[PDB]
Design a protein around this ligand. Structure first.
Ligand SMILES: Nc1ncnc2c1ncn2[C@@H]1O[C@H](COP(=O)(O)OP(=O)(O)O)[C@@H](O)[C@H]1O
Ligand SMILES: [Mg+2]
Ligand SMILES: [Mg+2]
Ligand SMILES: [Mg+2]
Length: 1284
C-alpha cells in the first residue's frame, strides 16, 4: 500500500501473524466471560512507512525484507471486523525509534519514520454498538494506544504540526489573578507563597512571565524536586527539634565518613573499591586490555511510585532507566554494573487463587490493580535492565492491604499507589569522582534521545527506549576510558522537569549561567511549544559540559556509537539563564539564576505523636499446620521466580552470587555479589532490608529492623569492617496523614541519630516519596501506606568465593539459631498476623545494638575462617520459613527441636525478630558456639538439630511433634504464587511444566559430566610464544556484552579488538586482517524487526561490508563464533556463510518470556572445531534470551539438519536426557538444539553465553572441586590452538 500523507507518502506493509494459539485462546476466553459472542479472532502486524522520497525497486525490496520477521505462525486470510490497534496519535513508539534507525542504517534515508500496529480480525456477527466498543477495550491499552477502523487511519500518526509559540501570562494586565489562573490551567500546584514570590519577581523585572518560565519554576519547586519535607524545621509534641530529616541522615556521614569518596553532592554516592584490572578497549588501538587501578563503587536507589500506578510497564522501565542515568552521570562519567528491584503493592487477588486474608476494598478507576502492576511492572523493569545490559541481582516484593487499627484508628492500609524501587552499583575511576570545573564558554550538550511531549492521567504515562540509553553509555564509557583526556567536565542526568531543571542545575552547580538556543535541541515533534520542548520529561537524555576544543573528539565518539547529541548552549560567567528561539526570533526565558532558583521560606511542620496501642493476636482460627500453609502462600514470603528469571543475571560476566541458589536453582540468596573486575576475587555486594507493616505499630522499630535486615541479609559475605557497609535510605510515607509525620521524624532519628551511628553505618545516599496514599469514591475511601523505609546495603567484598548461601549440606552437621530477638518472640505485624487478617500487639525490633554489631562481627569471623556450611537469616515468615527455604535449597530434610525457644511454639516459629540459622560441620559446633560466646551472643544461640538427606521437615519440642511434613509438599505450596503468576502472564504450558517438576523429589539438580581435563590449558604452548592472534569482537548499536566476550578470548591468548559496525563501514577496520571473528550478545537495535535482523540486514544491504563478511567466511582457515545476539545475527547471514544452508532461525521462546537461566546442556558430536574434545560433556551454562527458539521450515528441514550432523549443543534435563520440557529447555527448541556449526566446522553459533561463565566463580552453581577455569574456557582455548 502507498498513499499521500501530507507532504509525504505513507506505505502500508502487511506483517506476520502476531498472536500465538494460547494468546488467542486467552482472548476468546476473556470474551466469553464478558458475554461477548466472539467466534474467532486473528491478528496480524501491520507496518507504516512515512516516506519523504520514493523508493526504487531495490530499495522497496529491501524495506519489505526488513519488515519480514518473527515466529512463522499460521497465516490466515482476513475475515470479520477489522480493529486496528496503534500507538495513540501524538506519540511515537520506541519500536518506531529503533525500526526507523535500522532503515536509516540500511541506507534508506527516504524512510522518515516507521511505525507498527496490530490488525485484529474479529468474527462475531451478533454484537451491538456497546459490545463492539467493549471488544475494542479488551484489545488495547487505553493509556498508550487507540483503535482505528481503517488502515488508512494510521495517517493520523504522522501529522506534522506547526510549532506553537510561547505564551505569556498577563500579570501586568490582570494582576495576581493571572498567576492564579495559570496555576490552575497549567496545573502548576503552586503554594500561595510561591505565587507571591513569582508576583514580586516579575513585577520587579517589569515584564510578564512566559508560561515556560512559570512551568520550569513549578517543577523545580515541587515536593518531588525540592524535598521541602526533608529540609523543614520540626516541632513535635510542642518541642522544636534541632535537626531536619536530611541533617539527621547526614549525621551518619559526620559520624562515619570512613571509605566515602562522595556523598550528598552528586546523583549517587561513591565509596572506595579495590585495585583491580579495569578491562576496556584503548581509544588508539581498539584493543581490549586490563588497566590495574582502583575500581571505586557508586550506588543509588530511586523510585517511580506514581507513574507505575498509572502505566506499570513504562513506569517501572523508566524507574530503572532514570536510576541508570544517575549512575553513569556520577562524577565525570561512570559505568553501571548491577541492579536491584523492589515492589510493594496491595493484595493480588489472583483469579481462582484467592487467599483467606484478601478482601476487595475497591480502588480508583484511574489506577491499575496490584495484579496488573505485578504483571507488567516487573517486565518493564526487566525490559530496561535486559536491553540496557545490567544484571538484576537482588530485590524484594511485598503485598499488603488490610483494614487495621493503627495510629489513626481503624483504616485501610496498603499500596494502591505502589512502591516501585530501582537501584544498583557501578564502578568509577578515582580521577572522575569529583565534578570538573565548568569553564566560561564551555559547550552545553544534550546527549541522548530526541524530545517528545512526555513530561507534560496521560501525563504519567512514561516511555522507555533502553537501546538509546545503551548507545549513550557507550559514549560515556569512551569518555571515562580516556582517563586524563576525558572530555566530560560535568555530566548530569535528565529527569524530573526535563531540561528546564537539568540544565539550570548543571550550570548552577558549576557556578555559571547559560545561554541556550531552543532550536538546537533534538526534537521529534515540531508542534511542541517552547514550554513543552524545555519541560518535557522524555527519557534517555543526559546534559554535559565540554570545552570547545574537545568538541571534535566528542563528536567522533558519538558518531562511532551512533549516539545522538547536540550542542544547545554555552556556559557564561554571568549567572543568568537565557533561552533563545531562532524560529520565532524571541527569548522564551530571560532570568537571573538567583531569581529562578530563589527559595521561598523554609517549611515548618508542627505535628504530634499518634501511637497505636496494638491488640493481642486472636488465635481462634490458628494452628501451626494451617499457619505454615498460609504463610507459604503470602506473596511476600512465597517463591519469587516470576520476578527473577525475567531479568538477566549474567551480563558483564562479573556475577558471582545471584538470587538462584544451588543445583535446584532455588531463589533464596540473601544478597547479591559481583566481582570487581574480570580478573579478581574482590567484589561488591548488595542487600535489602525492609519491614513496612511494623510501622503500623511502631515507626522507629520498623526503621531499625530495615537496617538490621539489610545487615543480616549481607552477613554471610566476606566484607570485614562493618564500616565498609554503606546504606541508601529511601523513605516512603503519606505525609499529612495523621501520625505519619511524627512517625517519619522518629523513624529517621532512630536510624540517623541513633542506630547507624552506634553500629558505624553511613547513609551517604537516599531519597523520599511523600504522598503514599490513594483516595476515591467507592459509592470517600482511602488506602494509606504504612511508613515504608527500604534500606539497601552496599559493600566492598574481600573475597567473593567465600560467600555462603542457604543451600544446606547433608554431611555431618549442626544447625544453630542466632536469636537476636533474645526470646521476645514478637508476633505483631508479622506474616503470621497478616495471613489471619490481623496486625497484632507488639512487633519485633532491634533488641540489643551491641549484640547486633557482635552478630555481624562474629559472622565475618566465621566467614573468613571458612567455618560455615550455609546461612539464611530470619525475616518474613520467621524461623519456619528460614528453615524451610534452607531445606528447599539443599533439597533435603530438617530435624529440629525448639523446646529451648519458649513454650509458645507459634511465637517461636513465626516471630520475625532479627537473626538466622547457620549450618556448621558437626565437628565445629563447640568451637563455633565458643566464638559466638566471645561476641556476647551465648544466650541468643540455640542448637536446633541437623539437616538430613531425605524429604522430611520435622520440628519437635521434647517428645512432642510440633509440626511434620513432606519438604517437597512445603516446597510446592511455596511455589504456587509464582506458578500462578507465570500461568497468567506467560505460556500456561510452560508455567505448569516448571511448577510440576518441583514436585519430583528425585530431581538430582544440576550435575556435571566431563569428557576432558578442565584444568589443562591446551593453549599455553601458544600463549608462551608471545604471538597473539587478533579476534574481531563485533558489535552494533544496542549490543551490550562485548567486554566480557573479549575477556574470554583474552585469557585464551587473543588480542581482542573492539570492532563496531561503524568501524567497518568507515574503513577503520577490515576483516581481511583477522583470522578469527565473534559476533556478541546484547540487544542490537533492541531486537526490533527480529533479534539480530537489523544487524544482519544492515550488513547485507551495505554491499561493501557484505562483501567483506562473505570474503572472510570463504577463506580456508578463518574461524567465526556467534553467541546469542551474534548467533541470531549470523543465522540471518547464511547466504554469506559456506555450509550453512541447513541452519534454523531463532525466534520468540515458547514461553513467550525472556529467560535468564542457568541451563544444563550436553556437547554433541559435530564438526565444530571450537567444541573439540568436549563431546559428551554435560555442564550448566548461562542463558539470557527471549528469542532463542530454534525454528525450522518443516520437519524435512529439521531432519536434514540433524542427519547432516551439525547440532553441537542440546539442552538436557537434570536426569541427563535431551529435552523440550520447560525450563530445562528454556526456549522450546526442537530436540533441545541450541548450537549448530557448519559442514567444515569453522563457524559455530550458539544461544547460551559461554563467555559469561568461563570463570568458575561466575557460575551460579558449580562442583566444589573446580579451579579458576570452568569447562567453557576450553572453547576459547580451542580457537587459539586451531589458529596455531
Ligand atoms: N522484585 C524482585 N526482583 C528481583 N528479585 C527479587 C525481587 N524480590 C525478591 N527477589 C529475590 O528473591 C529472593 C527471595 O526474596 P525475599 O524472600 O524477599 O528475600 P529475603 O526475605 O531474604 O530478604 C532473593 O534472592 C531476592 O533478591
Ligand atoms: Mg523471604
Ligand atoms: Mg533473607
Ligand atoms: Mg527482606
Amino acid at each position: 500500500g502507498l498513499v499521500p500523507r501530507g507532504s509525504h507518502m505513507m506505505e502500508i506493509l502487511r506483517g506476520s501473524p502476531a498472536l500465538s494459539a494460547f494468546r488467542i485462546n486467552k482472548l476468546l476466553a476473556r470474551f466469553q466471560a464478558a458475554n461477548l459472542q466472539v467466534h474467532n479472532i486473528y491478528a496480524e502486524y501491520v507496518h507504516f512507512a512515512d516516506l519523504n522520497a520514493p523508493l526504487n525497486d531495490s530499495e522497496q525490496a529491501q524495506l519489505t525484507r526488513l519488515l519480514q520477521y518473527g515466529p512463522a505462525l499460521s497465516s490466515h486470510t482476513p475475515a470479520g471486523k477489522l480493529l486496528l490497534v496503534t500507538p495513540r496519535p501524538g506519540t511515537i513508539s520506541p519500536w518506531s525509534s529503533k525500526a526507523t534507525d535500522i532503515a536509516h542504517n540500511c541506507g534508506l534515508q527516504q524512510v522518515d519514520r516507521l511505525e507498527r500496529g496490530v490488525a485484529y480480525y474479529i468474527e462475531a456477527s451478533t454484537l451491538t454498538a456497546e459490545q463492539w466498543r467493549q471488544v475494542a477495550a479488551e484489545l488495547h491499552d487505553r493509556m498508550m494506544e487507540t483503535v482505528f477502523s481503517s488502515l488508512t487511519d494510521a495517517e493520523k500518526l504522522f501529522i506534522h504540526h506547526q510549532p506553537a509559540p510561547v505564551s505569556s501570562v498577563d500579570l501586568l494586565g490582570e494582576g495576581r489573578q493571572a498567576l492564579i489562573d495559570a496555576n490552575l490551567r497549567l496545573g502548576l500546584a503552586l503554594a500561595e507563597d510561591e505565587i507571591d514570590y513569582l508576583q514580586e519577581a516579575f513585577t520587579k523585572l517589569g515584564r510578564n512571565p512566559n508560561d515556560i518560565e512559570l512551568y520550569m519554576f513549578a517543577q523545580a519547586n515541587s515536593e518531588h524536586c525540592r524535598h521541602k519535607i526533608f529540609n523543614a524545621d520540626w516541632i513535635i509534641d510542642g518541642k522544636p527539634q534541632p535537626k531536619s530529616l536530611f541533617k539527621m541522615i547526614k549525621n551518619t556521614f559526620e559520624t562515619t565518613p570512613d571509605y566515602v569518596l562522595s556523598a550528598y553532592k552528586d546523583n549517587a554516592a561513591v565509596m572506595e573499591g579495590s585495585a583491580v584490572g579495569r578491562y576496556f578497549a584503548d581509544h588508539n588501538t581498539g584493543r581490549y586490555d586490563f588497566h590495574q587501578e582502583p575500581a571505586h563503587i557508586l550506588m543509588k536507589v530511586e523510585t517511580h511510585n506514581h507513574p507505575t500506578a498509572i502505566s506499570p510497564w513504562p513506569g517501572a522501565a523508566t524507574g530503572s532507566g532514570g536510576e541508570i542515568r544517575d549512575e553513569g552521570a556520577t562524577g565525570r562519567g561512570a559505568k553501571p554494573k548491577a541492579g536491584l528491584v523492589g515492589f510493594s503493592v496491595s493484595n493480588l487477588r489472583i483469579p481462582g487463587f484467592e487467599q483467606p486474608w484478601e478482601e476487595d476494598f475497591g480502588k480508583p478507576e484511574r489506577i491499575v490493580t496490584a495484579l496488573d502492576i505485578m504483571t507488567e511492572g516487573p517486565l518493564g523493569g526487566a525490559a530496561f535492565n535486559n536491553e540496557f545490559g545490567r544484571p538484576a541481582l537482588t530485590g524484594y516484593f511485598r503485598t499488603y492491604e488490610e483494614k487495621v487499627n493503627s495510629h489513626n484508628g481503624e483504616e485501610l492500609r496498603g499500596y494502591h499507589k505502589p512502591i516501585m524501587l530501582a537501584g544498583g552499583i557501578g564502578n568509577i575511576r578515582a580521577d572522575h569522582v569529583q565534578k570538573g570545573e565548568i569553564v566560561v564558554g564551555a559547550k552545553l550538550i544534550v546527549l541522548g534521545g530526541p524530545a517528545m511531549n512526555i513530561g507534560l492521567d496521560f501525563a504519567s504515562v512514561q516511555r522507555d527506549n533502553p537501546e538509546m540509553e545503551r548507545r549513550c553509555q557507550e559514549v560515556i564509557d569512551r569518555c571515562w576510558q580516556l582517563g586524563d583526556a576525558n572530555p566530560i567536565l560535568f555530566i548530569h542526568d535528565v529527569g524530573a522537569g526535563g531540561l528546564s531543571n537539568a540544565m539550570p542545575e548543571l550550570v548552577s552547580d558549576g557556578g555559571r549561567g547559560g545561554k541556550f538556543e531552543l532550536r538546537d535541541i533534538l526534537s521529534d515533534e515540531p508542534g511542541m511549544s517552547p514550554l513543552e520542548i524545555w519541560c518535557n520529561e522524555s527519557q534517555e537524555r543526559y546534559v554535559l559540559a565540554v570545552a570547545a576544543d574537545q568538541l571534535p573528539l566528542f563528536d567522533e565518539l558519538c558518531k562511532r556509537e551512533r549516539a545522538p547529541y547536540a550542542v544547545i548552549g554555552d556556559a557564561t560567567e554571568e549567572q543568568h539563564l537565557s533561552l533563545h528561539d531562532n524560529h520565532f526570533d524571541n527569548q522564551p526565558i530571560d532570568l537571573p539564576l538567583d531569581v529562578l532558583l530563589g527559595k521561598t521560606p523554609k517549611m515548618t511542620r508542627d505535628v504530634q505523636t499518634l501511637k497505636a496501642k496494638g491488640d493481642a493476636l486472636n488465635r481462634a482460627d490458628i494452628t501451626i499446620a494451617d499457619a505454615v500453609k498460609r504463610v507459604l502462600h503470602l506473596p511476600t514470603v512465597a517463591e519469587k521466580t516470576f520476578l527473577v528469571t525475567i531479568g538477566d543475571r549474567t551480563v558483564t560476566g562479573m556475577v558471582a552470587r545471584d538470587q538462584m541458589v544451588g543445583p535446584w536453582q532455588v531463589p533464596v540468596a540473601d544478597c547479591a555479589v559481583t566481582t570487581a573486575s574480570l580478573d579478581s576475587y574482590y567484589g561488591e555486594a548488595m542487600s535489602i532490608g525492609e519491614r513496612a507493616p511494623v510501622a503500623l505499630l511502631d515507626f522507629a522499630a520498623s526503621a531499625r529492623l530495615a537496617v538490621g535486615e539489610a545487615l543480616t541479609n549481607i552477613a554471610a559475605t566476606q566484607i570485614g569492617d562493618i564500616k565498609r557497609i554503606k546504606l541508601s535510605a529511601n523513605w516512603m510515607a503519606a505525609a499529612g496523614h495523621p501520625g505519619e509525620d511524627a512517625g517519619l521524624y522518629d523513624a529517621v532519628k532512630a536510624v540517623g541519630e541513633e542506630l547507624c551511628p552506634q553500629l558505624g553505618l553511613t547513609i551517604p545516599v537516599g531519597k523520599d516519596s511523600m504522598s503514599m496514599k490513594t483516595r476515591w469514591q467507592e459509592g470517600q475511601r482511602e488506602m494509606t501506606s504504612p511508613l515504608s523505609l527500604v534500606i539497601s546495603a552496599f559493600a566492598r567484598v574481600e573475597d567473593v568465593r567465600h560467600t555462603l548461601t542457604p543451600q544446606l549440606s547433608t554431611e555431618d552437621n549442626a544447625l544453630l539459631l542466632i536469636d537476636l530477638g533474645k526470646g521476645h518472640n514478637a508476633l505483631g505485624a508479622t506474616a503470621l498476623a497478616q495471613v489471619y487478617r490481623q496486625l497484632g500487639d507488639k512487633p519485633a525490633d532491634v533488641r540489643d545494638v551491641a549484640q547486633l554489631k557482635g552478630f555481624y562481627d562474629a559472622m565475618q569471623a566465621l566467614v573468613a575462617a571458612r567455618k560455615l556450611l550455609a546461612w539464611h537469616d530470619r525475616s518474613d515468615g520467621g524461623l519456619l520459613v528460614t528453615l524451610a527455604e534452607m531445606a528447599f535449597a539443599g533439597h533435603c530434610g530438617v530435624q529440629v527441636d525448639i523446646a529451648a525457644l519458649g513454650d509458645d511454639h507459634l511465637a517461636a516459629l513465626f516471630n520475625e525478630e532479627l537473626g538466622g540459622v547457620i549450618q556448621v560441620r558437626a565437628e565445629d559446633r563447640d568451637a563455633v558456639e565458643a566464638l559466638l560466646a566471645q561476641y556476647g551472643l551465648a544466650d541468643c544461640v540455640h542448637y536446633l538439630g541437623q539437616a538430613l538427606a531425605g524429604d522430611r521437615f520435622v520440628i519437635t519440642a521434647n517428645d512432642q511433634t510440633v509440626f511434620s511434613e513432606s519438604r517437597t509438599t512445603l516446597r510446592v505450596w511455596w511455589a504456587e504464587t509464582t506458578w500462578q503468576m507465570q500461568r497468567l502472564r506467560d505460556n500456561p504450558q510452560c508455567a505448569d511444566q516448571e511448577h510440576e517438576a518441583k514436585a519430583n523429589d528425585t530431581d538430582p539438580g544440576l550435575n556435571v559430566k566431563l569428557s576432558f581435563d578442565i584444568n589443562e590449558d591446551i593453549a599455553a604452548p601458544y600463549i608462551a610464544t608471545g604471538a597473539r592472534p587478533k579476534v574481531a569482537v563485533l558489535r552494533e548499536q544496542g549490543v551490550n556484552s562485548h567486554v566480557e566476550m573479549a575477556a574470554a578470548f583474552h585469557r585464551a591468548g587473543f588480542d581482542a579488538i573492539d570492532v563496531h559496525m561503524s568501524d567497518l563501514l568507515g574503513g577503520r577496520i577490515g576483516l581481511g586482517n583477522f583470522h578469527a571473528l565473534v559476533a556478541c550478545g546484547g540487544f542490537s537495535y533492541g531486537d526490533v524487526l527480529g533479534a539480530g535482523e537489523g544487524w544482519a540486514k544492515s550488513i547485507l544491504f551495505n554491499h561493501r561490508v557484505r562483501d567483506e563478511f562473505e570474503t572472510f567466511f570463504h577463506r580456508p582457515q578463518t574461524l567465526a563464533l556467534g553467541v546469542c545476539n551474534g548467533c541470531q545475527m549470523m543465522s540471518n547471514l547464511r547466504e554469506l556463510i559456506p555450509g550453512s544452508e541447513l541452519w534454523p532461525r531463532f525466534v520468540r521462546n515458547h514461553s513467550d518470556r525472556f529467560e535468564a537461566r542457568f541451563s544444563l546442556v550436553e556437547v554433541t558430536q559435530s564438526p565444530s572445531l571450537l567444541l573439540q574434545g568436549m563431546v559428551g560433556s554435560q555442564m550448566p551454562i548461562a542463558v539470557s534470551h527471549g528469542e532463542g527458539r530454534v525454528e525450522v521450515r518443516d520437519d524435512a528441514h529439521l531432519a536434514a539438519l540433524e542427519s547432516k550432523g551439525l547440532v553441537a549443543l542440546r539442552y538436557v534435563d537434570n536426569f541427563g536426557k535431551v529435552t523440550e520440557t520447560y525450563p530445562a529447555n528454556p526456549n522450546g527448541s526442537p530436540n533441545g538444539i541450541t548450537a549448530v556449526t557448519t559442514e567444515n566446522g569453522r563457524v559455530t553459533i550458539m544461544m547460551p553465553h559461554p563467555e559469561r561463565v568461563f570463570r568458575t566463580v561466575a557460575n551460579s552453581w558449580h562442583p566444589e572441586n573446580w579451579g579458576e577455569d570452568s569447562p567453557w574456557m576450553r572453547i576459547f582455548r580451542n580457537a587459539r590452538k586451531q589458529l596455531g
